[PDB]
């Protein structure tokens, strides 16, 4: 999924916030991995996305 820079800090067990309450919630016993990378070149345009 695409997210607003700062938000990345929410995608983690026990975190709160809009994304971590109404959009995507992680269980406290989660195991796995998370990859996150900026995509200002593609997902953002000066013409408005």
């Amino acid at each position: 999924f695409v997210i607003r820079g700062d938000e990345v800090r929410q995608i983690a067990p026990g975190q709160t916030g809009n994304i971590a309450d109404y959009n995507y919630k992680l269980p406290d016993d989660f195991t796995g991995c998370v990859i996150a990378w900026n995509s200002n070149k593609l997902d953002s345009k000066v013409s408005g996305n």
Partner: nanobody, 124 residues
Framework: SAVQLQASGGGFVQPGGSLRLSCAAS????????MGWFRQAPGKEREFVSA????????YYADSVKGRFTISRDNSKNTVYLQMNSLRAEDTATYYC????????????????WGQGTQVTVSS
């Protein structure tokens, strides 16, 4: 984690002037943490100068360089920049950009990685 820091800038300057330093980071780390600069005077100990969060929200500066040094971040190059002025003789030293890999900064004692020394010299 595997993070490489590339430093750029430094040279010989006149007192009270301005110069150019910038540090870029590459690789992959645990999280988006803080980034700062460390000063080493010849014959002295290595002390921190400042520390900026990744998202440019909160800034931390040393009491000895407050109001004289500032640090900002790029918007399309992922390279931290810093500006300075009114340089004095004590500023002749070796500077290193360092990456702190935690979300919230508490103190400057634990340092993760270090960059190549950039020697800056000021005199008449």
């Amino acid at each position: 984690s595997a993070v490489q820091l590339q430093a750029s800038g430094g040279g010989f300057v006149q007192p009270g002037g301005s110069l150019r330093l910038s540090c870029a980071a590459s690789g992959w780390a645990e999280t988006f943490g803080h980034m700062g600069w460390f000063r080493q005077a010849p014959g002295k100990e290595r002390e921190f100068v400042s520390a900026i969060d990744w998202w440019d929200t909160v800034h931390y500066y040393a009491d000895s360089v407050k109001g004289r040094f500032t640090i900002s971040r790029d918007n399309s190059k992922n390279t931290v920049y810093l500006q300075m002025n009114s340089l004095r003789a004590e500023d002749t030293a070796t500077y290193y950009c360092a990456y702190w890999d935690m979300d919230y900064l508490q103190n400057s004692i634990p340092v993760d990685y270090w960059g190549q020394g950039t020697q800056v010299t000021v005199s008449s």
